[PDB]
Design an enzyme around this catalytic site. Structure first.
Site, PDB file in Angstrom:
ATOM      1  N   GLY A  73      -2.367   0.668  -1.131  1.00 31.15           N
ATOM      2  CA  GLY A  73      -2.618   1.261  -2.429  1.00 31.15           C
ATOM      3  C   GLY A  73      -4.104   1.209  -2.731  1.00 31.15           C
ATOM      4  O   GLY A  73      -4.646   2.087  -3.405  1.00 31.15           O
ATOM      5  N   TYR A 123     -11.328  -3.395   1.195  1.00 33.22           N
ATOM      6  CA  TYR A 123     -11.032  -4.263   2.328  1.00 33.22           C
ATOM      7  C   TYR A 123     -12.180  -4.336   3.326  1.00 33.22           C
ATOM      8  O   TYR A 123     -11.971  -4.623   4.501  1.00 33.22           O
ATOM      9  CB  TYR A 123      -9.756  -3.786   3.028  1.00 33.22           C
ATOM     10  CG  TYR A 123      -8.510  -3.978   2.192  1.00 33.22           C
ATOM     11  CD1 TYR A 123      -7.982  -5.248   1.981  1.00 33.22           C
ATOM     12  CD2 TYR A 123      -7.871  -2.892   1.598  1.00 33.22           C
ATOM     13  CE1 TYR A 123      -6.850  -5.437   1.196  1.00 33.22           C
ATOM     14  CE2 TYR A 123      -6.736  -3.068   0.809  1.00 33.22           C
ATOM     15  CZ  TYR A 123      -6.233  -4.343   0.612  1.00 33.22           C
ATOM     16  OH  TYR A 123      -5.124  -4.524  -0.177  1.00 33.22           O
ATOM     17  N   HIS A 172     -11.416  -7.621  -2.029  1.00 39.17           N
ATOM     18  CA  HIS A 172     -10.296  -8.264  -1.345  1.00 39.17           C
ATOM     19  C   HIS A 172     -10.693  -8.980  -0.056  1.00 39.17           C
ATOM     20  O   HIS A 172      -9.979  -9.866   0.416  1.00 39.17           O
ATOM     21  CB  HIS A 172      -9.206  -7.236  -1.040  1.00 39.17           C
ATOM     22  CG  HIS A 172      -8.482  -6.748  -2.255  1.00 39.17           C
ATOM     23  ND1 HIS A 172      -8.080  -5.438  -2.405  1.00 39.17           N
ATOM     24  CD2 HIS A 172      -8.102  -7.390  -3.383  1.00 39.17           C
ATOM     25  CE1 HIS A 172      -7.480  -5.296  -3.573  1.00 39.17           C
ATOM     26  NE2 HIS A 172      -7.480  -6.466  -4.187  1.00 39.17           N
TER      27      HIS A 172
HETATM   28  C1  LIG Z   1       5.536  -5.623  -4.033  1.00 39.59           C
HETATM   29  C2  LIG Z   1       4.359  -4.745  -3.662  1.00 39.59           C
HETATM   30  C3  LIG Z   1       3.215  -5.324  -3.149  1.00 39.59           C
HETATM   31  C4  LIG Z   1       2.082  -4.541  -2.784  1.00 39.59           C
HETATM   32  N1  LIG Z   1       0.987  -5.215  -2.281  1.00 39.59           N
HETATM   33  C5  LIG Z   1      -0.100  -4.499  -1.921  1.00 39.59           C
HETATM   34  C6  LIG Z   1      -1.266  -5.186  -1.384  1.00 39.59           C
HETATM   35  O1  LIG Z   1      -1.321  -6.388  -1.233  1.00 39.59           O
HETATM   36  N2  LIG Z   1      -2.352  -4.409  -1.036  1.00 39.59           N
HETATM   37  C7  LIG Z   1      -2.339  -2.988  -1.194  1.00 39.59           C
HETATM   38  O2  LIG Z   1      -3.325  -2.417  -0.861  1.00 39.59           O
HETATM   39  N3  LIG Z   1      -1.275  -2.339  -1.683  1.00 39.59           N
HETATM   40  C8  LIG Z   1      -0.152  -3.031  -2.058  1.00 39.59           C
HETATM   41  N4  LIG Z   1       0.940  -2.367  -2.558  1.00 39.59           N
HETATM   42  C9  LIG Z   1       0.923  -0.875  -2.701  1.00 39.59           C
HETATM   43  C10 LIG Z   1       1.620  -0.173  -1.486  1.00 39.59           C
HETATM   44  O3  LIG Z   1       0.910  -0.539  -0.313  1.00 39.59           O
HETATM   45  C11 LIG Z   1       1.583   1.343  -1.696  1.00 39.59           C
HETATM   46  O4  LIG Z   1       2.290   1.656  -2.882  1.00 39.59           O
HETATM   47  C12 LIG Z   1       2.265   2.077  -0.525  1.00 39.59           C
HETATM   48  O5  LIG Z   1       1.584   1.784   0.726  1.00 39.59           O
HETATM   49  C13 LIG Z   1       2.224   3.582  -0.801  1.00 39.59           C
HETATM   50  O6  LIG Z   1       2.947   4.341   0.408  1.00 39.59           O
HETATM   51  P1  LIG Z   1       4.395   4.805   0.285  1.00 39.59           P
HETATM   52  O7  LIG Z   1       4.894   4.676   1.755  1.00 39.59           O
HETATM   53  O8  LIG Z   1       5.153   4.107  -0.645  1.00 39.59           O
HETATM   54  O9  LIG Z   1       4.418   6.195  -0.181  1.00 39.59           O
HETATM   55  P2  LIG Z   1       4.386   6.978  -1.564  1.00 39.59           P
HETATM   56  O10 LIG Z   1       4.319   6.189  -2.655  1.00 39.59           O
HETATM   57  O11 LIG Z   1       5.351   8.109  -1.519  1.00 39.59           O
HETATM   58  O12 LIG Z   1       3.093   7.791  -1.541  1.00 39.59           O
HETATM   59  C14 LIG Z   1       2.763   8.757  -0.490  1.00 39.59           C
HETATM   60  C15 LIG Z   1       2.308  10.063  -1.194  1.00 39.59           C
HETATM   61  O13 LIG Z   1       2.498  11.122  -0.200  1.00 39.59           O
HETATM   62  C16 LIG Z   1       3.493  12.082  -0.737  1.00 39.59           C
HETATM   63  N5  LIG Z   1       4.235  12.440   0.478  1.00 39.59           N
HETATM   64  C17 LIG Z   1       5.452  11.934   0.886  1.00 39.59           C
HETATM   65  N6  LIG Z   1       5.870  12.453   2.035  1.00 39.59           N
HETATM   66  C18 LIG Z   1       4.888  13.339   2.400  1.00 39.59           C
HETATM   67  C19 LIG Z   1       4.754  14.228   3.574  1.00 39.59           C
HETATM   68  N7  LIG Z   1       5.641  14.316   4.535  1.00 39.59           N
HETATM   69  N8  LIG Z   1       3.600  14.989   3.596  1.00 39.59           N
HETATM   70  C20 LIG Z   1       2.648  14.926   2.611  1.00 39.59           C
HETATM   71  N9  LIG Z   1       2.692  14.144   1.508  1.00 39.59           N
HETATM   72  C21 LIG Z   1       3.833  13.362   1.446  1.00 39.59           C
HETATM   73  C22 LIG Z   1       4.240  11.316  -1.798  1.00 39.59           C
HETATM   74  O14 LIG Z   1       4.797  12.197  -2.727  1.00 39.59           O
HETATM   75  C23 LIG Z   1       3.090  10.537  -2.427  1.00 39.59           C
HETATM   76  O15 LIG Z   1       2.338  11.188  -3.425  1.00 39.59           O
HETATM   77  C24 LIG Z   1       2.137  -3.104  -2.954  1.00 39.59           C
HETATM   78  C25 LIG Z   1       3.302  -2.493  -3.477  1.00 39.59           C
HETATM   79  C26 LIG Z   1       4.418  -3.283  -3.835  1.00 39.59           C
HETATM   80  C27 LIG Z   1       5.651  -2.598  -4.389  1.00 39.59           C
END
Ligand SMILES: Cc1cc2nc3c(=O)[nH]c(=O)nc-3n(C[C@H](O)[C@H](O)[C@H](O)COP(=O)(O)OP(=O)(O)OC[C@H]3O[C@@H](n4cnc5c(N)ncnc54)[C@H](O)[C@@H]3O)c2cc1C
EC number: 1.6.5.2
Length: 272
Positions: free
Chosen positions: A148, A154, A160
């Site tokens: 995220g 990083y 971080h």
């Molecule tokens: C408990 C928890 C802890 C976390 N800890 C950290 C941390 O320590 N450090 C950190 O950096 N982050 C952290 N995060 C954030 C997390 O890493 C991100 O929310 C996550 O990596 C986002 O990727 P996603 O796979 O969920 O996809 P999504 O949330 O869906 O986002 C991907 C985007 O691409 C779109 N998309 C989907 N499929 C396609 C496709 N085929 N082609 C084009 N576009 C597409 C989606 O609509 C969206 O807008 C944490 C989240 C949680 C819930």
């Protein structure tokens, strides 16, 4: 070669992680790869280790010790059917891809529990054949991560800290400890803030790379030959190696910084 296993750790099918998982399967298949999957969430995988992992009589029901009990169970074939199924996939896999979103500067709880239940002693490791001399020494593993936060966060001066330190416990302690040949991690920063067109290129780039991963060079880890393997010594660096390193500017790796400077991108970029 020819046999790959993709371990996904994401609940949604509308996520980029799922998109990245589907892109990898396609590319590998197009190249003639046998792709086996492990969608932990879809399989409703159980991440908690317990006496239940052992389908039989325990050597010491009064004083249950997982390490000892799980090893014996593995030896006698008394492991839970779901654990044995995942182990069967690994044995046949040449390349193992781990697709997951960075969660709390680490691996998702469901994936962590996967390592803890599937990587049983004697099967995935031995204190008689650690690291580069491990059972999976003929396999290659790659981590595909999404975050995220941005890359700048990083970086060495990021709030971080160095991502190389965060990747260390996973790529070394877990993957390489078992013998795996860890390849450069596929890092995707701030995927929630990247334009659509850019997201398309990331997937295209991912597919392009998977076309020749097998030919890639793995990350650098301090060889086990530089240590005295036995407790009489304490599994410490060989005296000879220690002296010869005193006149060096950098350490061996992130964990073996030896008190000196850490080789830049040691856990992110290959070569030495
Ligand atoms: C408990 C928890 C802890 C976390 N800890 C950290 C941390 O320590 N450090 C950190 O950096 N982050 C952290 N995060 C954030 C997390 O890493 C991100 O929310 C996550 O990596 C986002 O990727 P996603 O796979 O969920 O996809 P999504 O949330 O869906 O986002 C991907 C985007 O691409 C779109 N998309 C989907 N499929 C396609 C496709 N085929 N082609 C084009 N576009 C597409 C989606 O609509 C969206 O807008 C944490 C989240 C949680 C819930």
């Amino acid at each position: 070669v020819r046999r790959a296993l993709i371990v996904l750790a994401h609940s949604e099918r509308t996520s980029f992680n799922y998109a990245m998982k589907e892109a990898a399967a396609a590319a590998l298949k197009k190249k003639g790869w046998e792709v086996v999957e492990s969608d932990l969430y879809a399989m409703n995988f159980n991440p908690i280790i317990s006496r239940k992992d052992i389908t039989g009589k325990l050597k010491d029901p009064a004083n249950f010790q997982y390490p000892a009990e799980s090893v014996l169970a593995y030896k006698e074939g008394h492991l839970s059917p779901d654990i044995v199924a995942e182990q069967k996939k690994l044995e046949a896999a040449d390349l193992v891809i781990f697709q997951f979103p960075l969660q709390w500067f680490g691996v998702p709880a469901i994936l962590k529990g996967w390592f803890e239940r599937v990587f049983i002693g004697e099967f995935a490791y031995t204190y008689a054949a650690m690291y580069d001399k491990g059972p999976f020494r003929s396999k290659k593993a790659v981590l595909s991560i999404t975050t995220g936060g941005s890359g700048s966060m990083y970086s060495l001066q990021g709030i971080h800290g160095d991502m190389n330190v965060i990747l260390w416990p996973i790529q070394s302690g877990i993957l390489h400890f078992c013998g795996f040949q860890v390849l450069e991690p596929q890092l995707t920063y701030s995927i929630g803030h990247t334009p659509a067109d850019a997201r398309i290129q990331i997937l295209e780039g991912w597919k392009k790379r998977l076309e020749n991963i097998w030919d890639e060079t793995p990350l650098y880890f301090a060889p086990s030959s530089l240590f005295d393997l036995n407790f009489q010594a304490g599994f410490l660096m060989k005296k000879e190696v220690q002296d010869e390193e005193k006149n060096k500017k950098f350490g061996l790796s992130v964990g073996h910084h030896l008190g000196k400077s850490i080789p830049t991108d040691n856990q992110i970029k290959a070569r030495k």
